[PDB]
A = this chain, B = another copy of it.
Amino acid sequence: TTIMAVQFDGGVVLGADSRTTTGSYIANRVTDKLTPIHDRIFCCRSGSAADTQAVADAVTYQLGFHSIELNEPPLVHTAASLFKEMCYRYREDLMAGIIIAGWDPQEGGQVYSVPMGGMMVRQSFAIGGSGSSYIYGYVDATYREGMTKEECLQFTANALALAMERDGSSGGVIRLAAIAESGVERQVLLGDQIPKFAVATL
């Protein structure tokens, strides 16, 4: 797995690969790792499929009830907090590396990392999953302050394409989502639509 999210002025971009593995068999080649927690709050999931699905279902429930009680859209920081609380409390029983990203009217576009262990930290952009090792350098060199939404999408698809190339544990299709005040725009980059970089033949 490789997952990624980027902040822009007005929203966020999230991305993931689509590979689920047992050992080195691919149990799902078109996995959807970007799961909706509310109208405009997504999590990207890495680690145990069972753990991240169960945790995401539980936070979705917690947040939905909270949101009806307050009669307001939920804060992205509140979704991240609920993830953090459950991932920290059950850190010895869970294997989950989470990125929470979305939009709310109070703080706009936000990205939070909740890595294994259950710390929480807000970031301009975040990457996670096994494949993320292979793109630290790339994203450190490419990231620019003030990127537009389209630039964030391109940056995300590039980074994931590179990770997917090298990580055996990542692969398949790239799933992207953009979240802003106006709503959620999802898409799939597959086959020739995935950014290409030559193998360096002699």
Contact = CB atoms under 8 A, between A and B. Distances in A.
Interface of A: 122-125, 133-143, 145, 158-159, 162-163, 165-166, 197-198, 200-202
A125 B199 CA distance: 11
Given A134-B137, A138-B138, A141-B162, 12 more contacts: A133-B133, A133-B134, A135-B138, A136-B137, A136-B162, A136-B166, A137-B137, A137-B159, A137-B162, A138-B140, A141-B197, A143-B200
10 contacts: A124-B201, A125-B200, A134-B134, A135-B138, A136-B137, A136-B162, A137-B163, A140-B162, A140-B165, A140-B166
B123 A202 contact: yes
Contact of A202 (B122, B137, B162, B200): B122
Copies of this protein in the complex: 2
B124 A202 contact: yes
Contacts of A134: 133-134, 136-137
Contacts of A136: 134, 137, 162, 166
